[PDB]
Design a protein around this ligand. Structure first.
Ligand SMILES: [Zn+2]
Length: 255
């Protein structure tokens, strides 16, 4: 009815998942259109105080952190957004699980911060409308040191190991979960990557990654359980054909 790696393949139950402009996609940087209109991203309100706490929950498909009101993200003139939630996609032991790929390369994991256009008061109004939702996406890679910002979330996974369980976590700097380079990114129009696969979503994928320790990546991929009694692993959708869409780059590809 809705699960990674099997049946139903999604269009049988959610026809919009067979649309022509779906996400995620494979990014080929030498083929992206360099677009100097794409200026550095602007975030405000992402540095949260310790109280009030946020909600962290295992929904069977990911771990999702609900963000409080007041987080603003600007992609450019006329493209202002309010953050709603973030969640992650990952693989398993020795197997990467990012959703986007770069030249076919899959990264260990990926963070998605989902936002609602300021044109709309409610998510339901914005579904399927061009630009109504925007997602910021960054790849997570292995580095040598523990990532202190991620540890605030990863240390709480054990208590929400069971599908459907929830907890509360202190406010933290949400921007410290994202790359520091706000100037280099790719952007394209796609869809939600889970059913109902609604189109019109503006995807922004940072070029720079974030680094977590090997232990932290194991904690992320190995702690949670999903539907039935499977481990919550490999929770990524396969990449989708561009079907003529152009991916834009905010920076000149190096090579
Ligand atoms: Zn996602």
């Amino acid at each position: 009815h809705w699960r990674y790696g099997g049946d139903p393949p999604w269009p049988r139950v959610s026809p919009a998942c067979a649309g022509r402009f779906q996400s995620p996609v494979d990014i080929r940087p030498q083929l992206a259109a360099f677009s100097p209109a794409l200026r550095p991203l602007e975030l405000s309100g992402f540095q949260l105080p310790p109280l009030p706490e946020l909600r962290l929950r295992n929904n069977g498909h990911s771990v999702q952190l609900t963000l409080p009101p007041g987080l603003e993200m600007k992609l450019g003139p006329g493209r202002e957004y309010r953050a709603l939630q973030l969640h992650l996609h990952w693989g398993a032991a020795g197997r990467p699980g990012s959703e986007h790929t770069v030249e076919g390369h899959r990264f260990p994991a990926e963070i998605h911060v989902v936002h609602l256009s300021t044109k709309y008061a409610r998510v339901d109004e914005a579904l399927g409308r061009p630009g109504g939702l925007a997602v910021l996406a960054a790849f997570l890679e292995e580095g040598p040191e523990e990532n202190s910002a991620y540890e605030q979330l990863l240390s709480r996974l054990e208590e929400i190991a069971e599908e459907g369980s929830e907890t509360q976590v202190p406010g933290l700097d949400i921007s410290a979960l994202l790359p520091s380079d706000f100037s280099r990114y790719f952007q394209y129009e796609g869809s939600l990557t889970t059913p109902p696969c609604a189109q019109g979503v503006i995807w922004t994928v940072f070029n720079q990654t974030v680094s977590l320790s090997a232990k932290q990546l194991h904690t992320l991929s190995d702690t949670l359980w999903g539907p039935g009694d499977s481990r919550l692993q490999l929770n990524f959708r396969a990449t989708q054909p561009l079907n003529g869409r152009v991916i834009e780059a905010s920076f000149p590809a190096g090579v």
